[PDB]
């Protein structure tokens, strides 16, 4: 009965840029999801394919915890069936997702005077990501008929852009930390259970 190490995910001092989202595998442990659900710190707590009322009564083969920073008005893209720059090019949930999405405002940690440089997102991609796909490449995006030949400029775009979070931004443009919990059930022994 070791307790699941969710603190390492939720309380990490730095989070990943969404294009380079992080994942931690959680297994062989007991989780009290009510602590997360009841925390006043989280302004989003939305589950799909499972009801919150059941989280402490179920066992799963593995839980994955993916985490990253996006801007507030993009949190809505972290849900099945959604679209936009984040869902299309950065982090994509599947239609049949079973899991929960948890988010909170991180303006106090993730903005900087003069604009934070640390948090980037992919702005251009030739096709949409498949669910749970990850793209950390930085090839020049060729927007037109002229080959870019490894040089950024007209019609030749570097594909990642900084959010530039500044503490004075409006709330929709402020950083939010996001943790996505996936509940995986395989034909294998369950290892992560509620209490």
């Amino acid at each position, epitope marked *: 009965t070791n307790l699941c190490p969710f603190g390492e995910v939720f309380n990490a001092t730095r989070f*990943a*840029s969404v294009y*380079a989202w*992080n*994942r931690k595998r959680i297994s062989n442990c007991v989780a009290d999801y009510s602590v997360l659900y009841n925390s006043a710190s989280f302004s989003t707590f939305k589950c799909y394919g499972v009801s919150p009322t059941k989280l402490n009564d179920l066992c799963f083969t593995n839980v994955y915890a993916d985490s990253f920073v996006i801007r507030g008005d993009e949190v809505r893209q972290i849900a099945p069936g959604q679209t936009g720059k984040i869902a299309d090019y950065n982090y994509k949930l599947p239609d049949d997702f079973t899991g929960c999405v948890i988010a909170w405002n991180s303006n106090n940690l993730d903005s900087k*005077v*003069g*604009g934070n*440089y*640390n948090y*980037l997102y992919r702005l251009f991609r030739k096709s949409n990501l498949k669910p749970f796909e990850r793209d*950390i*490449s*930085t*090839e*020049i995006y060729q927007a037109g008929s002229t080959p870019c030949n*490894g*040089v*950024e*400029g007209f019609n*030749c775009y*570097f594909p*990642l*852009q*900084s959010y*530039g979070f500044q503490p004075t931004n409006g709330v929709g443009y402020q950083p939010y930390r996001v943790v996505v919990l996936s509940f995986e059930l395989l034909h294998a022994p369950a290892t992560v259970c509620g209490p």
Partner: nanobody
Amino acid sequence: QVQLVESGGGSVQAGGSLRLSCAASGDTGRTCNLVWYRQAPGKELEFVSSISDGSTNYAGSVKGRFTISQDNAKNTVYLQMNSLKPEDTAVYYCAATISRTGSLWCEEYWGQGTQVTVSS
């Protein structure tokens, strides 16, 4: 336990040169890629150059003047900056995606920045 440490910034006269270094240390595994960016305060972070598995790219404004290279024997990438111009003044940052021992996931790390100031 991976860290990126920059070195090499400073003040130079227009036309001069500097060489920046971005050195990875700790429980490093494979580097998937590495990007040099620059930002002056309040301005949007700007792409400068990147390198991945030997392929390189550059901002149009620095192509021909700056060269990115991977050290043939060290966990370090250099940015050689020649023919410097006042417009090159900024804090330069490296960012890399690197897996750590025990993992196949390349995770993002950032250097601490180095000021470059070019005066006319």
